[PDB]
Amino acid sequence: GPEYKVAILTVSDTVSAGAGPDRSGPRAVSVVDSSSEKLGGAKVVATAVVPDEVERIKDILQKWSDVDEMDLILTLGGTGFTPRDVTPEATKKVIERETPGLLFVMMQESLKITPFAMLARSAAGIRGSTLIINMPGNPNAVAECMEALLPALKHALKQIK
Amino acid sequence: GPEYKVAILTVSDTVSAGAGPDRSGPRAVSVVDSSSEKLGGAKVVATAVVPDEVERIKDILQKWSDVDEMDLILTLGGTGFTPRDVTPEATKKVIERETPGLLFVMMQESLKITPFAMLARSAAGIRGSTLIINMPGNPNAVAECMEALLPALKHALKQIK
Amino acid sequence: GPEYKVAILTVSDTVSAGAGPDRSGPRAVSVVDSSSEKLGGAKVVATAVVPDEVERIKDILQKWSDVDEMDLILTLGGTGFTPRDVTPEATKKVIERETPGLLFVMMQESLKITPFAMLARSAAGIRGSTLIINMPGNPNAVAECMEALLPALKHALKQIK
Ligand SMILES: [N]C1=NC2=C([N][C]3[C]([N]2)O[C]([C]OP([O])([O])=OP([O])(=O)O[C][C]2O[C](N4[C]=NC5=C4N=[C]N=C5[N])[C]([O])[C]2[O])C([S])=C3[S])C(=O)[N]1
Ligand SMILES: [N]C1=NC2=C([N][C]3[C]([N]2)O[C]([C]OP([O])([O])=OP([O])(=O)O[C][C]2O[C](N4[C]=NC5=C4N=[C]N=C5[N])[C]([O])[C]2[O])C([S])=C3[S])C(=O)[N]1
Ligand SMILES: [N]C1=NC2=C([N][C]3[C]([N]2)O[C]([C]OP([O])([O])=OP([O])(=O)O[C][C]2O[C](N4[C]=NC5=C4N=[C]N=C5[N])[C]([O])[C]2[O])C([S])=C3[S])C(=O)[N]1
Ligand SMILES: [Cu+]
Ligand SMILES: [Cu+]
Ligand SMILES: [Cu+]
C-alpha cells in the first residue's frame, strides 16, 4: 500500500438516499491521485457516503481513524448554513487537536474564487495519527481547497506519524 | 413584514446606564436598511441595549432567536480586550453551529482599515434559524464589517431557513 | 519594574531534558526588548523551559497569570502536528477569553514567509489580566509573529488592565 492512506467521505442525504450520484467524491479522488507524489506518496484507498447525520459521520470518522488506520480523511459536503449541514459538528466531536491553519488557508484561497466561500463552516484536526479535513460539497471546491493545502500537506502527514 | 427580520443589540454599560447615547446602533440600522435589497429583503424590526453582562446578553439572544423569530441578530460592542468585554462569551453559549467564515471575512477586511481590528474577539453562529454575528462597538466598524459580509449574507439567510 | 511584565515559556522536551540549548527563547527576549517602547514599556522579567507535557505547561501558565502577575506570556514551541505538540491544548485549558484576531494576524503574516505557517496550531487568549500567546518553536518564527502583532499589542495590553 501507499505511504499515506487517504479516505474520502461524501456527506450527503441525496447521494446516500440514491437520489443523485456523487460528483464531489470522484473529483477529490482525482485531485489526491494526481498530487500523490507532492503529498509524499498518498493514495485514496477507500471512499464512502453517509447521510447528513451527526452520529453516522462520527461513527465512520472514528472507525477510519481508530480501526482502519487511515492517515488522511477528507470529508465532502455538509459544511454550509442549512439545518442539515452538520459535518463540522460531527468532526469537532471526533478530533482531538484542532488544526486551524489548514482552515485559514482553505478560506483565504477559496475567497479569491467566490465570496460564498465564507459560508463554509469546515472544521479540521487530528485524531490519533489521522488528519481529518472538512471540504465543501461543491464539486469544484475540493480541487481549490487541496491546491491551498498542497504546499504543506506532505509535511503535515509526516509530522502526525 | 420583511423577508428577513433583523434585530440589533447594542452591548454597552455606558449606554445601558444612560451615561451616553447609542452611536453604533443607528449606524447598524442605516447600513442594513440601505442594503435591504442586497440582503434579500431585510429590515431592522427591533433594537435593544443591554449592559456588558453575560446573562443579560444571553437572555436577549435566546429570546430573539427562540421566541421572537428573528432571522439575523447583529450585536455591537463588547468584543475587545477589556475585562468587561464579554459579548463573544455570551454569544458562544447561545449559538449551536459556529460560522467561522463570517469572522474570517470581517477580520480580513477590517485589518485593511486598521491594525486594531485584531483586538475584536467577535463570535458568530447559528441558533435554530437565526444567524448571530458580533460586531465591534466602534460606530464605523459595523459599516466596514457589513460591507465585508454583504456579498454572501443573502445566501446565508436563505440557507438558514 | 516595567509597565508590562513579559514572561517567555519555551516548550520543548529537548531543551527541558538538556539535549540541546534554547534558541527560540533568546530570540523572543530580543524581539520584546527591542520593541519595548512600541509595546508601551514592556520588559521580559522571567523565562522558563518546560517539556511537551500538558500539565507542566498549564501549571506554569496558571502560576504566572494568577500568582506572579505577568501581563504577557509568550510560549514558544509545541504548536505543530506531531503527537508531542500539545501547547495549544494546554493553553486552551487556562485561557478564559479567546483572542482569535491575534492568531489571524500571526497566520496571515507568517504565510507570506512560508506555507508551513499553516502547520502552527497556536492558541491565544486572556486569563485575568494576562494575555497568553502561542508562537511556533522555529527560532525565526517569534520575530515574524511579533512583527505581525506589534501594531496593536500595546493597545491590547492597556485594555486588559
Ligand atoms: N473553494 C470553494 N469553497 C466553497 C465553495 N462553495 C461555497 C462554500 N465554499 O461552501 C459552502 C458550504 O457548502 P456545503 O454545505 O459543504 O455544500 P453542500 O450543501 O453539501 O453542497 C453544495 C451544493 O453542491 C452540490 N453537491 C454537494 N455534494 C455533492 C454535490 N453534487 C454532487 N455530488 C455530491 N456529493 C449540491 O448541488 C449542493 O446543493 C457554500 S453554501 C458555498 S456556495 C466553492 O465553490 N469553492
Ligand atoms: N472594522 C473595524 N473593526 C474594528 C474597529 N475597532 C477595533 C476592533 N475592530 O474592535 C476592537 C474591539 O472593540 P469593542 O470592544 O467591541 O468596542 P467597545 O469597547 O464596545 O467600543 C469601543 C469604543 O467605541 C465606542 N462605542 C462602543 N459602543 C458605542 C460606542 N459609542 C457610542 N455608542 C455605542 N453604542 C466607545 O467610545 C468605546 O470606547 C477594538 S478595541 C478596536 S480599536 C474598527 O474601528 N473597525
Ligand atoms: N512565522 C513562522 N511561522 C511558522 C514557522 N514554522 C512552521 C509553523 N509556523 O510552525 C509549525 C509548528 O511548529 P512547532 O511545533 O511550534 O515548532 P516545534 O516542533 O516546537 O519546533 C520546530 C523546530 O524548531 C526547532 N526548535 C523549536 N524550539 C526550539 C528549537 N530550536 C532551538 N531551541 C528551541 N527552543 C527544532 O529543531 C524543531 O524541530 C511548523 S511545523 C512549521 S515548519 C516559521 O518558520 N515562521
Ligand atoms: Cu452555497
Ligand atoms: Cu480599541
Ligand atoms: Cu515544520
- Report whether B109 belongs to an annotated binding site: no
Contact pairs from chain A to chain B, CB under 8 Å = 54
By C-alpha distance, which of A66, A83, A55 is closest to A7? A66
Q: What is the structure's resolution, reported in angstroms to one decimal?
A: 1.5
- Check CB contact under 8 Å for B116 and C152: yes
Is the Cβ of B149 closer than 8 Å to some Cβ of chain A?
yes
Q: Are the beta carbons of B147 and B110 closer than 8 angstroms?
A: no
Amino acid present at B33: D
A101 annotated ligand-binding residue:
no
Pairing of strands C130-135, C124-127: antiparallel
Alpha carbon of B125 to ligand 2 centroid (Å): 21
Sheet containing C42-50: give its strands across. C42-50, C4-11, C72-76, C130-135, C124-127, C97-98
Atom of ligand 3 nearest to the CA of C145: 1
Q: Is C78 annotated for ligand binding?
A: yes
The structure was resolved experimentally with: X-ray
DSSP C39: T
Contact B159 A88 (CB under 8 A): no
- The answer to whether B112 faces chain A, any CB pair under 8 Å, is no
B111: contact with A, CB 8 A cutoff: no
The strand ranges marked E within B55-109 are 72-76, 97-98
Distance of CA A16 to the CA centre of its chain: 17
Query: Judging by beta carbons within 10 Å of its beta carbon (0-12, 13-18, 19+), is residue A29 exposed, middle or buried?
Result: middle
Provide the Cα torsion A92, A96, A99, A103; round to 10°: -10
What is the C-alpha to C-alpha distance for residues A127 and A124, in angstroms, rounded to an integer?
A: 10
- Name the residue of chain C whose CA is nearest to B84's CA: C160
Residue C118: which of A97, A131, A152 has the nearest Cβ? A152
Q: What are phi and psi of B35, to 5 degrees?
A: -110, 20
Q: Please give the grid coordinates belonging to residue A6.
A: 487517504
**CA A22 remoteness from chain centre:** 15
Angstrom distance (rounded) from CA B14 to CA B99: 29
Q: Is B137 annotated as a binding residue?
A: yes
How far is the C-alpha of C78 from the C-alpha of C53, rounded, in Å? 9
- A118: chain B residues, CB-CB within 8 Å: 101-102, 104-105, 149, 151-152
Cα A155 to ligand 6 centroid, rounded to whole Å:
7
Sign of CA dihedral A92, A97, A100, A103: negative
Closest by CA to B25, choosing from B143, B157, B147, is B143
- Residue C138's alpha-carbon distances to B37, C12, C15, C75, C76, in angstroms, are 49, 11, 13, 12, 8
Q: What is the number of other CB atoms lying within 10 angstroms of the CB of residue A136?
A: 27
Bridge partner residues of A97 (DSSP) = A126
Taking the CB of residue A18, how many other CB atoms lie within 10 A of it? 8
Within 8 A of B151 by CB-CB distance, chain A residues are: 115-116, 118
Bridging pattern class, strands C42-50 and C4-11: parallel
Q: Phi/psi of residue A63, each to 5°?
A: -60, -45
- B21 close to A (CB below 8 A): no
Determine the atom of ligand 2 nearest the C-alpha atom of B121: 12
Residue with cell 505581525: C148
DSSP B141-158: HHHHHHHHHHHHHHHHHH
Q: What length does chain B have?
A: 161
Q: Which amino acid is at C7?
A: A
Helix, strand, coil share (%) of chain A residues, nearest 5:
45, 20, 30
Using CB atoms, pick whichever of A104, A111, A121 lies closest to residue B97.
Answer: A121
Nearest CA to ligand 1 atom 10: A120
Could you tell me which CATH number the domain at A1-161 has? 3.40.980.10
Nearest-by-CA chain A residue for C83 = A160
Residue in A118, A134, A145 to test binding to B, most B beta-carbons within 10 Å? A118
Longest dimension (CA), chain B: 40
CA distance C12 to C9: 9
